[PDB]
Ligand binder design. Sequence first.
Ligand code: CLA
Ligand code: CLA
Ligand code: CLA
Ligand code: CLA
Ligand code: CLA
Ligand SMILES: CC1=C(/C=C/C(C)=C/C=C/C(C)=C/C=C/C=C(C)/C=C/C=C(C)/C=C/C2=C(C)CCCC2(C)C)C(C)(C)CCC1
Ligand SMILES: CC1=C(/C=C/C(C)=C/C=C/C(C)=C/C=C/C=C(C)/C=C/C=C(C)/C=C/C2=C(C)CCCC2(C)C)C(C)(C)CCC1
Ligand SMILES: CC1=C(/C=C/C(C)=C/C=C/C(C)=C/C=C/C=C(C)/C=C/C=C(C)/C=C/C2=C(C)CCCC2(C)C)C(C)(C)CCC1
Ligand code: OEX
Ligand SMILES: [Cl-]
Ligand SMILES: [Cl-]
Ligand SMILES: [Fe+2]
Lengths: 450, 341, 81, 30, 34, 333, 137
Amino acid sequence: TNRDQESSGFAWWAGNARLINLSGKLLGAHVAHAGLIVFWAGAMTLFELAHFIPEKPMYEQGLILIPHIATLGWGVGPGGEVVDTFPFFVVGVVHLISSAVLGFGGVYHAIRGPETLEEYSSFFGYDWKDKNKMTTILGFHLIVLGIGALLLVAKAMFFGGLYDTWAPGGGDVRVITNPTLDPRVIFGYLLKSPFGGEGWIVSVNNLEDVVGGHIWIGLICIAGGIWHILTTPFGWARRAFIWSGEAYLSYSLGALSMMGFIATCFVWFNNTVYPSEFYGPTGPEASQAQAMTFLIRDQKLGANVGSAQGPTGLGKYLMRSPTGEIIFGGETMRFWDFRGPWLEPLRGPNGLDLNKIKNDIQPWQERRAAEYMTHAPLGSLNSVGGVATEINSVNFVSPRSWLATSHFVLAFFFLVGHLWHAGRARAAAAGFEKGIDRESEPVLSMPSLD
Amino acid sequence: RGWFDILDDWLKRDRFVFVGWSGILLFPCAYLALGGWLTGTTFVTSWYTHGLASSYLEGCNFLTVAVSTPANSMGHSLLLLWGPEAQGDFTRWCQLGGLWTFIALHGAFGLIGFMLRQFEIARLVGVRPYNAIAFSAPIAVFVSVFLIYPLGQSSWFFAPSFGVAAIFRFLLFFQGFHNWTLNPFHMMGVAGVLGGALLCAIHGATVENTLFQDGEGASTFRAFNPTQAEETYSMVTANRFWSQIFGIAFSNKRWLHFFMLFVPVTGLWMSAIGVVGLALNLRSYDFISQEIRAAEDPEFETFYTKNLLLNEGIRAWMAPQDQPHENFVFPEEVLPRGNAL
Amino acid sequence: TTGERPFSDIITSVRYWVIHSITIPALFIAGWLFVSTGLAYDVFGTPRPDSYYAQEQRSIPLVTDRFEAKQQVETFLEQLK
Amino acid sequence: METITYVFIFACIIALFFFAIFFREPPRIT
Amino acid sequence: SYPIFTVRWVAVHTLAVPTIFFLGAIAAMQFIQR
Amino acid sequence: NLWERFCNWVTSTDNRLYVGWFGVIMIPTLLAATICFVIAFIAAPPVDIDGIREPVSGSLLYGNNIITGAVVPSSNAIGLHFYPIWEAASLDEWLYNGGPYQLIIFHFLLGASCYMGRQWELSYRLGMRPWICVAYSAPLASAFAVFLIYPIGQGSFSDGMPLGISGTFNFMIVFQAEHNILMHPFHQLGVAGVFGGALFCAMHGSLVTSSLIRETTETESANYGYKFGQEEETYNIVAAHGYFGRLIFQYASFNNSRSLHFFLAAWPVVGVWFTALGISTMAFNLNGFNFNHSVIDAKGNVINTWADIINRANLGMEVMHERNAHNFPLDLA
Amino acid sequence: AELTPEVLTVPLNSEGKTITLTEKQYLEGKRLFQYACASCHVGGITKTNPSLDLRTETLALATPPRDNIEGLVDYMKNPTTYDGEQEIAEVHPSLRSADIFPKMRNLTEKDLVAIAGHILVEPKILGDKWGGGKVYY
Ligand code: CLA
Ligand code: CLA
Ligand code: CLA
Ligand code: CLA
Ligand code: CLA
Ligand SMILES: CC1=C(/C=C/C(C)=C/C=C/C(C)=C/C=C/C=C(C)/C=C/C=C(C)/C=C/C2=C(C)CCCC2(C)C)C(C)(C)CCC1
Ligand SMILES: CC1=C(/C=C/C(C)=C/C=C/C(C)=C/C=C/C=C(C)/C=C/C=C(C)/C=C/C2=C(C)CCCC2(C)C)C(C)(C)CCC1
Ligand SMILES: CC1=C(/C=C/C(C)=C/C=C/C(C)=C/C=C/C=C(C)/C=C/C=C(C)/C=C/C2=C(C)CCCC2(C)C)C(C)(C)CCC1
Ligand code: OEX
Ligand SMILES: [Cl-]
Ligand SMILES: [Cl-]
Ligand SMILES: [Fe+2]
């Protein structure tokens, strides 16, 4: 049965390693785990909805899943205001039911179905060292991922659109009719620097680029899936990789760690696919909002904000970036690359325009600045809003903080897991994962260093 | 045989819990110290000694409970229950901080009993007593910090209170008032502690990654026999690995394990010496040349001068509440602060 | 190995649970009633939530003399806590 | 003279690093 | 066969009896209102 | 074939220091970072770290000593912008804005990641088990947290840890002021990791030294009783297990040396993993526990705790840190 | 010290009439304050304008006086500047600007009375801590 240490070589704390060469039970483990994921999605959505106050902003209510559905244009109107709550309920309920179905399948294949799929079928039975079968399964899953990307495209283009925080008038659910299919624009994001001002693919700032990139990634994933169904790994690929289950797991672990770090930076910096109406302001957004708020207040009191000198000699409200752009002064000089829909009407060719600052600041911009200043993504582990020195009065930690922290923890641990499994796959393929053979110790056959 | 020999035979009998002659000192004192800490953090306030809530009964959590030190006006009183301050009143004794002196003294004699236990068991089983010698460093730390440091100061009040957030207060107090990070003895202590953690991790990983294959199971923990005569890992392979990775490597196992003894013990002893220096307020607070230059030149700035400004902030902003016996009334206009914030 | 019954043999015995389904809840109830009747406040001198301050005071009852500290605490408690 | 002292001690440490790595006692298996 | 009251019994109960008493006390504390 | 000969030299186990391909990346980056660090620590001009035209002197030639000297982080005006030498108009502008810090930290992070990879590589070439690099991933994660991840979360490389002793102390104190790291459970796990690592290091060393088998006289050192490459164990693990099992109780003592050494590896590595994650999660401003004004009496008066005293100390550091850099009431980043 | 009815007695209007809030009224007032006002008025200070606070003396010197229940409820309905010359409902939460400040949409007059009572009672409990800022933390 391979369910003890003696017959399998693995202790109980590595007991899932007993599933490596048992395709049916491994499939059961995977399907049950997918059921767990869908279960969390549905149950968490229903939990969030049950404690959802529609007239309070989503980022004040500890919501991470409802903002995702809102970003898809479901249940929201202009300005991010919730107009209907039933789409959130539908998403949660359908995930809960589908998770029951997936849990049934996982349990069946894990404890009742055949332990190996090779005798039952040749289509579903696989060997880890059969490279063509591995590429065939990879191709099937690439086609599925491409269809998912095209499903996002279909939602954006034909099924109501997406929430656009950059939409003219204040942000609204908009149908994307002209996606950016230009490969220079799309693949210019991939060759952009990850550093300040550039920000790589995290810096995508319009839904047209998002939909065009998703068209490209859906078509590329479908094409690569067909490629791997039709082809076999080449000689350089066969010589460059370890071909085993733990090796493929380690490759996926490295990929997932990289994706986790990317998602952390995406939720921390991007306010386009993570609109600040739903997720709250970013840190740069909140700092710029504080500078804007006190600029407005002192300008109302009569200060000449263009000529006001701070304690150090720099501009108290307005200064210059290292490349000359007129930016907000103070420590928020670090955040001068921030772009937001509430701040862009005041920005001219040379940065913040003094004339627009003096007479074009509207009350909605001031309300947005005050709201984003007082909902900065700073909070305690017990969810006390503000800096670490604040007193207990405000129950607030930003969803951006929760998502970024959790996915950095997960991405780092998955990098560690990738290192573990990559080293172990190399050692097991080379044949010394269980230790050094006493009779054939390699170092004893090597010349001395000195 | 005699009553002494029969009693010695009983005390040294093999049990689940060894007692020994040292047990008579260890088990009462250690049990009372632990029970006093739990009793204090569960039921006893600091309202009359510090003006603080410090028990679960007052609504504090595990991080914020403490058995606080006695009030400053008590001085270095032993604060015995029958002593002239409490006069046998257990309730007043708890309210006056007598539980702190109870825990501190019972803990000191419990640590003495534990090192005597180490010596006694080492003598009984026939091993060298290097564990007691290693345990001298925690005893030195406890004596320097909880006994020598308040004895140098005005009272028991400035000793650490037995609690998590109270110990954090002790850390921040030493930063603000002593500049304890700048003290080279504390630097040697940090070096010893972090080097001991490094040596622990690196030696464990090196042993686990140079194991001989002594079994067919993938989980290698089964392959070790406690009574086997052979080494369970390859010292030659480990030496070559670290020689080619780091440049230098251990080649003597006995020297390796003595070094693992030596590093954190020496670090803790150096930090205890520094704590005695701080008991007399003999701080490594300032570099005189940098002070002279910064005083005569308002453009000279280092991270050390910034740390001094931070220490001034710590002292001014925490002194009225951390030292309520001084009756510090600092008006808002005398508080040092930067622009805005 | 030391001549005592193993813990697994004891805590899986019915006799142990016959004793301890009585003794463990009795101690739990004893501690619960020690708090809920207010005996802990009297034994340890811990202020009740209405006992930190007199109604109009904001100063803290800090002891300032070593040998009359008991009298100072009794004076502080006499001032309607 | 203080800067010279610090740099001199650091340089002696680096020289000791060189001698400890490349002119060590060679570990001989026995 | 096995003696019931030993040194181990004494150590175990001197740790366990006040532990359950204190756990009951703190559990009662959780419902205290100001 | 020349490329085959170069590959054989690079992966050779007969080199005095192993190179490997992780080494062909590691050696130039670490040499560049080391040379730039020594030159900057000795002779760099003062650096405007806060971006407020108040340069901080960090090198020995400009009035520092070993304790107070540092390589000062790049300017707050730079923020997260990439600032190589060729992006400056001159070297004097590059030195004024803190370019050496960026060069050193980027080269050091690349070199240290390749050091981890090189540890794996040599373990693979020698037929070892491969997880020494996993143990080294904990200090590497700590270095990434303090040099890269905290600047990324705060939005400026000026908030990264300075390359010096007193600058490190400044980093610690300001971090406690703004994030209450002491009250964060991940840092408490890290303190448990390092304290336990020192404890178990001293414990394992003292237990092995205690149980050393007599192979010498009182005249000679006990270390000469061990010979390099001997098959027999130099100490009696049964005697040490008997001692430690009588010290606490028997089942608290390891009798398996492999399990014991795995525990020695695992405790500080997991603790330092959690404290590096603590620094990263406070970089995204998920701060330590806030218990300020948590204990409230019947009337509503605040009853102070030790957390409130910590809050007073944190307030002192907060109001005094970067005393000229703030124009607005909230220190958002 | 307890939450006595003498503590919960605050001036109702500018004439001199007073109102004794119940303990439940004070608790609901504090809850509503945390729900709608505390993100900028935590502890009695004003985050987006620290020159003004919620101390009783500052509210008394406001035009019209805001150191009573009726004045505070009127401010919650029609907020003005400190001298009362300019209406600021477009940038301050109010019953009239509940469209743009949605947390004011379901606030009854009894809720406004509870918030006003909490604002007027908290200085009497906290001393200089209310509207005093980080100096008094
Ligand atoms: C996502 C988590 C997950 C999943 C999917 C699995 C799945 C599996 N593990 Mg496993 N495992 C896990 C976590 C998980 N494990 C953890 C955390 C540990 C460490 C403690 C282990 C330790 C471990 C060991 C030591 C072994 C396995 C084995 C197995 C396989 C056979 C199970 C078996 O025979 O159980 C039999 C058990 C039962 C029949 C008891 C009932 C269990 C059912 C499934 C519970 C279902 C509950 C659910 C509410 C039902 C919903 C139904 C509804 C949808 C209609 C199976 C594929 C074995 C293996 O490799 O097989 C060769 C094996 O030896 N595991
Ligand atoms: C998709 C990801 C993935 C997959 C499929 C695997 C699969 C596997 N891993 Mg692996 N691993 C991963 C990620 C993954 N890992 C990551 C991210 C790390 C880094 C932490 C590791 C580190 C790791 C080690 C160190 C080892 C494995 C091993 C194994 C094998 C046996 C596992 C087993 O039985 O677990 C049994 C499960 C448990 C014992 C439970 C662990 C409990 C976790 C650590 C606590 C979770 C805390 C929770 C999230 C938060 C609190 C919850 C609350 C209850 C308190 C199996 C092939 C073993 C191996 O090499 O076998 C060949 C092995 O020794 N893994
Ligand atoms: C990754 C998922 C996955 C995979 C690879 C398999 C694979 C297999 N299952 Mg299995 N199963 C699954 C999920 C899965 N199942 C789930 C979720 C359930 C619960 C309903 C079951 C219940 C189940 C039973 C009861 C039995 C199997 C059997 C089998 C084997 C033969 C099936 C066959 O010939 O299909 C032939 C092909 C078809 C029937 C076509 C089906 C078309 C589907 C319904 C359309 C799905 C659309 C889309 C791709 C799904 C997206 C889902 C996503 C949104 C979550 C094969 C090894 C049989 C077996 O092992 O017998 C020995 C068997 O008796 N399965
Ligand atoms: C989940 C996705 C996935 C996975 C796992 C694979 C897996 C594989 N593919 Mg593949 N492929 C995919 C999607 C995927 N494919 C798609 C969508 C397409 C269509 C565009 C292709 C098209 C494709 C072709 C045309 C070929 C493969 C090949 C291979 C095999 C060798 C991989 C290899 O050495 O590359 C590792 C990567 C390299 C060797 C490139 C050099 C490494 C550089 C320096 C890395 C630079 C990136 C760096 C990390 C920075 C990131 C940012 C950057 C993008 C700017 C392997 C089985 C080969 C094969 O054997 O075919 C049968 C092959 O010739 N793939
Ligand atoms: C053997 C273990 C042990 C040890 C070393 C200590 C040690 C101590 N306890 Mg302690 N204690 C113990 C067990 C122990 N305790 C137990 C089991 C209990 C529970 C009953 C207590 C309960 C307890 C309380 C409640 C208090 C202490 C306190 C103290 C400290 C001061 C005691 C003192 O001055 O008396 C010194 C007395 C002696 C050394 C005895 C002298 C014996 C010699 C032979 C002389 C005998 C003379 C003659 C035969 C009889 C007297 C003559 C007559 C005229 C009076 C001291 C550090 C006090 C404290 O911590 O203050 C903060 C305190 O208040 N203890
Ligand atoms: C193999 C194995 C395992 C695992 C398992 C799993 C993982 C499973 C899964 C499972 C699952 C995954 C399940 C699920 C289920 C679900 C269900 C059964 C559901 C149902 C639902 C309902 C009933 C609904 C309801 C409702 C609605 C309609 C709406 C409103 C609300 C409510 C909720 C009421 C373990 C680890 C134990 C170990 C051993 C073996
Ligand atoms: C614009 C846009 C977009 C798009 C994007 C895209 C289109 C992407 C793609 C991307 C891609 C296309 C990617 C790729 C990547 C790659 C990688 C990640 C690689 C890796 C590699 C490896 C891992 C290798 C390795 C190696 C070496 C180095 C040497 C030898 C050995 C081996 C082989 C191992 C989106 C959707 C966002 C939306 C928004 C906008
Ligand atoms: C002072 C005094 C005394 C003493 C007493 C005693 C000795 C007591 C004891 C007491 C005790 C002896 C108590 C106990 C307690 C305990 C508790 C209260 C516990 C709790 C626990 C828990 C809650 C758990 C936790 C944990 C851990 C730690 C970790 C992780 C996991 C868990 C969560 C499970 C005498 C009379 C002599 C004299 C007078 C004075
Ligand atoms: O740069 Mn370095 O330390 Ca982070 O918080 Mn904002 O920025 Mn500044 O103040 Mn606080
Ligand atoms: Cl600073
Ligand atoms: Cl600022
Ligand atoms: Fe060892």
